[PDB]
mmCIF file with all atom_site columns, N, CA and C in Angstrom:
data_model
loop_
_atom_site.group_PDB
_atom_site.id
_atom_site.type_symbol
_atom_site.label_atom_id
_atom_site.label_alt_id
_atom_site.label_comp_id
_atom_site.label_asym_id
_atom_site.label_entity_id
_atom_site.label_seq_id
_atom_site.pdbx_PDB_ins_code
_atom_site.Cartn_x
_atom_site.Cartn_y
_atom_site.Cartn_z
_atom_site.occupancy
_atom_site.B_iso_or_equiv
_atom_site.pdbx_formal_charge
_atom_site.auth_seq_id
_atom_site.auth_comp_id
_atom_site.auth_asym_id
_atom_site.auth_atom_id
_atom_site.pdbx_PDB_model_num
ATOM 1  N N  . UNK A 1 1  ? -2.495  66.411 -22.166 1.00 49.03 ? 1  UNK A N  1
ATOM 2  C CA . UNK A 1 1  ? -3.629  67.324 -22.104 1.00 49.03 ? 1  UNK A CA 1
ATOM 3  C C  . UNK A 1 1  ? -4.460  67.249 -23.382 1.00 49.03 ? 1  UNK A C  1
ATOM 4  N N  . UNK A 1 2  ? -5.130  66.133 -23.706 1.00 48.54 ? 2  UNK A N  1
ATOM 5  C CA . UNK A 1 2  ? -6.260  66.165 -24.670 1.00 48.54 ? 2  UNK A CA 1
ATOM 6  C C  . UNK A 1 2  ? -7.317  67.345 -24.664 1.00 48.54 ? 2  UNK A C  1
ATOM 7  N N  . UNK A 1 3  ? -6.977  68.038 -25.578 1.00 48.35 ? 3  UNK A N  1
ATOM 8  C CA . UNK A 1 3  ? -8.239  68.888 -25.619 1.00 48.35 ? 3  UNK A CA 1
ATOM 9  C C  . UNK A 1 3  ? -9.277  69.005 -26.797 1.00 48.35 ? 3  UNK A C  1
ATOM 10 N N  . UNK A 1 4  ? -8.603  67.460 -27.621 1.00 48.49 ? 4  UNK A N  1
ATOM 11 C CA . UNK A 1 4  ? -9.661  66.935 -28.519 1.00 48.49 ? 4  UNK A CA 1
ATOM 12 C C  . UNK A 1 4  ? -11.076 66.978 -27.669 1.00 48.49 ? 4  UNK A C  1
ATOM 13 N N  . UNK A 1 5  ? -10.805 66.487 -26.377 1.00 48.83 ? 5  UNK A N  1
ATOM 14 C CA . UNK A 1 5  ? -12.106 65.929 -25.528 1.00 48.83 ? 5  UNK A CA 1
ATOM 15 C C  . UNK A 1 5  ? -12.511 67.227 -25.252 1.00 48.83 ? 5  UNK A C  1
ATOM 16 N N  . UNK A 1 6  ? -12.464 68.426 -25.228 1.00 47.52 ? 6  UNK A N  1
ATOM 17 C CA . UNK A 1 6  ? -13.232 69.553 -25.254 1.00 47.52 ? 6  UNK A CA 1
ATOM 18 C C  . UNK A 1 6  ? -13.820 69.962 -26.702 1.00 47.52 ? 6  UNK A C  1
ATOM 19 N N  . UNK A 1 7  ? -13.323 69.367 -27.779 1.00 47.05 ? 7  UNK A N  1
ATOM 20 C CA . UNK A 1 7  ? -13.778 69.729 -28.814 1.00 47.05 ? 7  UNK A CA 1
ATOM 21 C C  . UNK A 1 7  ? -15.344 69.252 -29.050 1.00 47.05 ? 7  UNK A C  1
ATOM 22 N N  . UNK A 1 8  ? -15.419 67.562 -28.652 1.00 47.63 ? 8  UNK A N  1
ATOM 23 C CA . UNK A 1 8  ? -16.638 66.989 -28.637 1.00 47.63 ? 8  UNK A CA 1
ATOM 24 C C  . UNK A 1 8  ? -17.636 67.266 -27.669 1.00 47.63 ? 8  UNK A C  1
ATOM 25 N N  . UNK A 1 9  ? -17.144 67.220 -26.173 1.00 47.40 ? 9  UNK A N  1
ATOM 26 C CA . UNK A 1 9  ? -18.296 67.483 -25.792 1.00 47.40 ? 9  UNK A CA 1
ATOM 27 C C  . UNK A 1 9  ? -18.467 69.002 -25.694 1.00 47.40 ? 9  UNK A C  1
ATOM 28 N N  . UNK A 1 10 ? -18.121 70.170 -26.458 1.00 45.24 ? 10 UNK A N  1
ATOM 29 C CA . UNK A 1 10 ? -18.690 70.989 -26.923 1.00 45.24 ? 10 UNK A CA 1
ATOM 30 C C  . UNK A 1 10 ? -19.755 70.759 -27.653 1.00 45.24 ? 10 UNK A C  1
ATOM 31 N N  . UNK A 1 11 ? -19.931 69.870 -28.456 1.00 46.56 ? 11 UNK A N  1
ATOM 32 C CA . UNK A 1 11 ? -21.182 69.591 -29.222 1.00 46.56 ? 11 UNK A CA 1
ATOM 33 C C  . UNK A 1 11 ? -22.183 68.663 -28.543 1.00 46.56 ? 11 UNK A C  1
ATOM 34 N N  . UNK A 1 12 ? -21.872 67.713 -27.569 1.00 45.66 ? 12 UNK A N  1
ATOM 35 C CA . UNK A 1 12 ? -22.849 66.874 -26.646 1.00 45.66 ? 12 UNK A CA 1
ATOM 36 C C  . UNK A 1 12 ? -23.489 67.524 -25.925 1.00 45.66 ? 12 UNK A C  1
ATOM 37 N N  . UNK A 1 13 ? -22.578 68.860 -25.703 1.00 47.54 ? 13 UNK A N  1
ATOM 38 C CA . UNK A 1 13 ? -23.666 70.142 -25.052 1.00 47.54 ? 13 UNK A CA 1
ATOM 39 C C  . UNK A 1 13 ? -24.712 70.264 -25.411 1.00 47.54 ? 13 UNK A C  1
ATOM 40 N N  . UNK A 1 14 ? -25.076 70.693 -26.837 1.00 44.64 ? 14 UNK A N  1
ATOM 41 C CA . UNK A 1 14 ? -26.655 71.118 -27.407 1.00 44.64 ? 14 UNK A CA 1
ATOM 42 C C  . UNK A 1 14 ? -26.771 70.270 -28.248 1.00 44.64 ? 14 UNK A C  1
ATOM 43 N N  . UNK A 1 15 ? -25.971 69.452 -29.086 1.00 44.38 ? 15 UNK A N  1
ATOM 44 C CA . UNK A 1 15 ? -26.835 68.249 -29.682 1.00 44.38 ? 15 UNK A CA 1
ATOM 45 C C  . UNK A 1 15 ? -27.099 67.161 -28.483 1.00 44.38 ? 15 UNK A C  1
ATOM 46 N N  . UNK A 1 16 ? -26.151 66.385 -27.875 1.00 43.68 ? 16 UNK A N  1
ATOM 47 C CA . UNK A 1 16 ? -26.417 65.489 -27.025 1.00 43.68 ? 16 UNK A CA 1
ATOM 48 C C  . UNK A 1 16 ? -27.142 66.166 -25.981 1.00 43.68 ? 16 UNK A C  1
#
Protein backbone atom coordinates (compact mmCIF):
# COMPACT_ATOMS: atom_id res chain seq x y z
CA UNK A 1 0.00 0.00 0.00
CA UNK A 2 2.14 2.94 -1.27
CA UNK A 3 0.84 5.94 -0.02
CA UNK A 4 3.96 7.80 -1.05
CA UNK A 5 1.74 7.97 -4.36
CA UNK A 6 -0.87 10.01 -2.48
CA UNK A 7 1.68 12.23 -1.22
CA UNK A 8 2.58 13.48 -4.87
CA UNK A 9 -0.26 13.61 -6.59
CA UNK A 10 -1.56 15.70 -3.82
CA UNK A 11 0.54 18.32 -5.29
CA UNK A 12 -0.18 17.46 -9.24
CA UNK A 13 -3.53 18.49 -7.98
CA UNK A 14 -2.91 22.37 -7.99
CA UNK A 15 0.53 22.61 -9.24
CA UNK A 16 0.20 20.02 -12.08
Amino acid sequence: EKFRRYLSVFFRKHIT
